[PDB]
Design an enzyme around this catalytic site. Structure first.
Site, PDB file in Angstrom:
ATOM      1  N   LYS A  37       0.822  -1.203   0.000  1.00 25.95           N
ATOM      2  CA  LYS A  37       0.000   0.000   0.000  1.00 25.95           C
ATOM      3  C   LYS A  37       0.854   1.251   0.000  1.00 25.95           C
ATOM      4  O   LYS A  37       1.802   1.371   0.765  1.00 25.95           O
ATOM      5  CB  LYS A  37      -0.916   0.029   1.230  1.00 25.95           C
ATOM      6  CG  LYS A  37      -1.812   1.260   1.312  1.00 25.95           C
ATOM      7  CD  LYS A  37      -2.981   1.030   2.274  1.00 25.95           C
ATOM      8  CE  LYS A  37      -2.560   1.111   3.746  1.00 25.95           C
ATOM      9  NZ  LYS A  37      -2.116   2.493   4.118  1.00 25.95           N
ATOM     10  N   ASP A  90      -3.494   4.093  -2.136  1.00 28.25           N
ATOM     11  CA  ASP A  90      -4.516   4.550  -1.201  1.00 28.25           C
ATOM     12  C   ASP A  90      -4.497   6.081  -1.107  1.00 28.25           C
ATOM     13  O   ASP A  90      -3.855   6.648  -0.221  1.00 28.25           O
ATOM     14  CB  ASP A  90      -4.238   3.900   0.149  1.00 28.25           C
ATOM     15  CG  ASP A  90      -5.181   4.360   1.254  1.00 28.25           C
ATOM     16  OD1 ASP A  90      -6.285   4.881   0.976  1.00 28.25           O
ATOM     17  OD2 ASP A  90      -4.794   4.162   2.420  1.00 28.25           O
ATOM     18  N   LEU A  91      -5.192   6.734  -2.044  1.00 21.73           N
ATOM     19  CA  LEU A  91      -5.268   8.192  -2.104  1.00 21.73           C
ATOM     20  C   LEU A  91      -6.676   8.735  -1.774  1.00 21.73           C
ATOM     21  O   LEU A  91      -6.883   9.948  -1.689  1.00 21.73           O
ATOM     22  CB  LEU A  91      -4.834   8.670  -3.496  1.00 21.73           C
ATOM     23  CG  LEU A  91      -3.487   8.100  -3.963  1.00 21.73           C
ATOM     24  CD1 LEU A  91      -3.165   8.571  -5.367  1.00 21.73           C
ATOM     25  CD2 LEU A  91      -2.401   8.525  -2.994  1.00 21.73           C
ATOM     26  N   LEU A 138      -9.578   9.238  -3.399  1.00 24.30           N
ATOM     27  CA  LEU A 138     -10.050  10.310  -4.269  1.00 24.30           C
ATOM     28  C   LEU A 138     -11.489  10.682  -3.944  1.00 24.30           C
ATOM     29  O   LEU A 138     -12.346   9.812  -3.774  1.00 24.30           O
ATOM     30  CB  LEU A 138      -9.943   9.917  -5.747  1.00 24.30           C
ATOM     31  CG  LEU A 138      -8.559   9.878  -6.410  1.00 24.30           C
ATOM     32  CD1 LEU A 138      -7.729   8.770  -5.819  1.00 24.30           C
ATOM     33  CD2 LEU A 138      -8.718   9.651  -7.907  1.00 24.30           C
ATOM     34  N   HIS A 139     -11.738  11.986  -3.875  1.00 25.04           N
ATOM     35  CA  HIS A 139     -13.051  12.529  -3.556  1.00 25.04           C
ATOM     36  C   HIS A 139     -13.140  13.867  -4.290  1.00 25.04           C
ATOM     37  O   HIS A 139     -12.663  14.895  -3.795  1.00 25.04           O
ATOM     38  CB  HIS A 139     -13.143  12.738  -2.044  1.00 25.04           C
ATOM     39  CG  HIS A 139     -14.493  13.168  -1.558  1.00 25.04           C
ATOM     40  ND1 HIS A 139     -14.756  13.404  -0.225  1.00 25.04           N
ATOM     41  CD2 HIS A 139     -15.657  13.388  -2.216  1.00 25.04           C
ATOM     42  CE1 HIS A 139     -16.024  13.748  -0.082  1.00 25.04           C
ATOM     43  NE2 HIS A 139     -16.592  13.744  -1.275  1.00 25.04           N
ATOM     44  N   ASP A 140     -13.754  13.861  -5.467  1.00 27.56           N
ATOM     45  CA  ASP A 140     -13.845  15.077  -6.255  1.00 27.56           C
ATOM     46  C   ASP A 140     -15.024  14.947  -7.213  1.00 27.56           C
ATOM     47  O   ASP A 140     -15.727  13.937  -7.198  1.00 27.56           O
ATOM     48  CB  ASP A 140     -12.538  15.238  -7.042  1.00 27.56           C
ATOM     49  CG  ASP A 140     -12.222  16.675  -7.375  1.00 27.56           C
ATOM     50  OD1 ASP A 140     -13.150  17.407  -7.771  1.00 27.56           O
ATOM     51  OD2 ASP A 140     -11.043  17.068  -7.258  1.00 27.56           O
ATOM     52  N   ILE A 141     -15.255  15.950  -8.050  1.00 27.52           N
ATOM     53  CA  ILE A 141     -16.354  15.834  -8.998  1.00 27.52           C
ATOM     54  C   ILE A 141     -16.112  14.621  -9.915  1.00 27.52           C
ATOM     55  O   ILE A 141     -14.962  14.246 -10.184  1.00 27.52           O
ATOM     56  CB  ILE A 141     -16.506  17.111  -9.844  1.00 27.52           C
ATOM     57  CG1 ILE A 141     -15.276  17.313 -10.732  1.00 27.52           C
ATOM     58  CG2 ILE A 141     -16.702  18.303  -8.919  1.00 27.52           C
ATOM     59  CD1 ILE A 141     -15.424  18.446 -11.719  1.00 27.52           C
ATOM     60  N   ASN A 176     -16.110  13.813 -13.253  1.00 27.35           N
ATOM     61  CA  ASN A 176     -15.146  13.867 -14.346  1.00 27.35           C
ATOM     62  C   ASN A 176     -13.698  13.889 -13.877  1.00 27.35           C
ATOM     63  O   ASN A 176     -12.845  13.253 -14.479  1.00 27.35           O
ATOM     64  CB  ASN A 176     -15.426  15.074 -15.249  1.00 27.35           C
ATOM     65  CG  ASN A 176     -14.460  15.161 -16.428  1.00 27.35           C
ATOM     66  OD1 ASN A 176     -13.469  15.899 -16.394  1.00 27.35           O
ATOM     67  ND2 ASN A 176     -14.739  14.392 -17.471  1.00 27.35           N
ATOM     68  N   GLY A 230       0.702  -3.458   9.300  1.00 27.04           N
ATOM     69  CA  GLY A 230       1.498  -2.276   9.586  1.00 27.04           C
ATOM     70  C   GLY A 230       2.889  -2.526  10.155  1.00 27.04           C
ATOM     71  O   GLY A 230       3.650  -3.348   9.637  1.00 27.04           O
ATOM     72  N   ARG A 231       3.223  -1.816  11.230  1.00 28.95           N
ATOM     73  CA  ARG A 231       4.539  -1.926  11.857  1.00 28.95           C
ATOM     74  C   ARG A 231       4.952  -3.319  12.278  1.00 28.95           C
ATOM     75  O   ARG A 231       6.139  -3.641  12.273  1.00 28.95           O
ATOM     76  CB  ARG A 231       4.637  -0.997  13.067  1.00 28.95           C
ATOM     77  CG  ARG A 231       4.639   0.489  12.719  1.00 28.95           C
ATOM     78  CD  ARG A 231       5.703   0.798  11.674  1.00 28.95           C
ATOM     79  NE  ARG A 231       5.963   2.228  11.514  1.00 28.95           N
ATOM     80  CZ  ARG A 231       6.549   2.992  12.432  1.00 28.95           C
ATOM     81  NH1 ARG A 231       6.937   2.467  13.588  1.00 28.95           N
ATOM     82  NH2 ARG A 231       6.761   4.279  12.187  1.00 28.95           N
TER      83      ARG A 231
END
Lengths: 215, 215
Positions: free
Chosen positions: B29, B56-57, B59-62, B64, B194-195
């Site tokens: 990741k 793992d970014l 994304l949350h936008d319009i 298009n 994780g760790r």
């Protein structure tokens, strides 16, 4: 007052569009499509050209992650960043810490504004999908207040949404958003310019025209 | 079953940890803190090493914008990406389009899962800050349902949240999330390590232990 949306499908064309502005500094916006393909290199370029950068990635994650990311975006060279108010007061506050932490002492940290409800979210969506039970208008003012309470500098909002937010958050709360003239009349502080400028045959004269309609 | 979170502050440190896995492929990741400082190059590196990559970014936008960004993340070589269900069905459906548009024909598009409610969001935040009026658990299943309706392959959720989700969305709807053994009994498909692994003095031995406990 102008933020030029560099909505281009490549560093190639960005570079091409900016050529005549080699002598005219601009406040430019780098969206997630361009930034995810060019990486922090595109900001270095823009900074070298002498332009100020608005890194519009709308971070929305857990507090600690947004903080380390914002610290990194400061180091990168962003002059303005944004986040989702939906991320919560805690996450927004952590974003500000990250910015100061990645900003040299004395110098001013990069500005940070918040998305309330995307311009593409309508009432039906807020109602049926997000399950928020308050009008869209109130929800926007609420989120804007949340952002103001968290220490943010302003928000991204629709032109005719600016006065409502400033009345609630104070006239010093930035409004980043129609005619530049109309936009100015509606209370916006900054106008995001798209194809109007980026696709004009005479970019330098269009830009000058733009400043005059606003003046 | 295992997704190793490469939560390291620099590309060097990342390359250092992965050295012993040069012969043992992993599902890793890449968070926004690392990706925003290394850009698409870090994925190429990981891909060269032969590891699968979860960008793992969130994304949350319009619509298009997420679509064009997903087409690009597919071109970057991401095997799994994610988005916020808060973005709406349209934005989520648009993400799937972008992924297909950036995936060669005859090949399989990269998986896409959604964030329902960040694991750091509590009942008070959902109530006071977000304006959502339904209980946290119901809002989570709802958002998950929203993602299933949009065509997404799953969601990020709590170990003790997957049973409720799969019951509501279908046993095939992926649950990405406590002990490995525990996480397994609770209904999860993937566990983000994780760790306990990235900071292990014997990573290869430790990795073998995880697979054994899960098995």
């Amino acid at each position: 007052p102008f933020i030029v949306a560099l909505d281009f499908p490549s560093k190639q064309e960005v570079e091409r569009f900016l050529r005549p502005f080699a002598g005219t500094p601009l406040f430019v916006k780098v969206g997630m499509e361009l930034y995810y393909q060019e990486g922090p290199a595109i900001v270095a370029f823009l900074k070298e050209q002498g332009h100020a950068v608005f890194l519009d990635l709308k971070l929305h994650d857990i507090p600690n992650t947004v903080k380390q990311a914002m610290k990194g975006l400061a180091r990168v060279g962003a002059d303005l960043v944004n986040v989702h108010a939906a991320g919560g007061r805690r996450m927004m506050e952590a974003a500000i810490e990250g910015l100061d932490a990645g900003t040299p002492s004395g110098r001013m940290r990069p500005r940070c504004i918040a998305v309330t409800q995307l311009t593409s979210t309508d009432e039906r969506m807020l109602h049926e999908e997000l399950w928020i039970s308050r009008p869209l208008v109130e929800t926007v003012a609420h989120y804007a207040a949340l952002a103001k309470e968290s220490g943010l500098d302003g928000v991204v909002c629709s032109a005719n949404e600016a006065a409502f937010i400033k009345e609630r958050c104070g006239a010093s709360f930035l409004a980043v958003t129609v005619t530049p003239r109309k936009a100015r009349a509606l209370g916006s502080d900054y106008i995001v310019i798209g194809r109007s400028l980026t696709r004009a045959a005479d970019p330098l004269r269009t830009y000058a025209r733009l400043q005059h309609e606003w003046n």
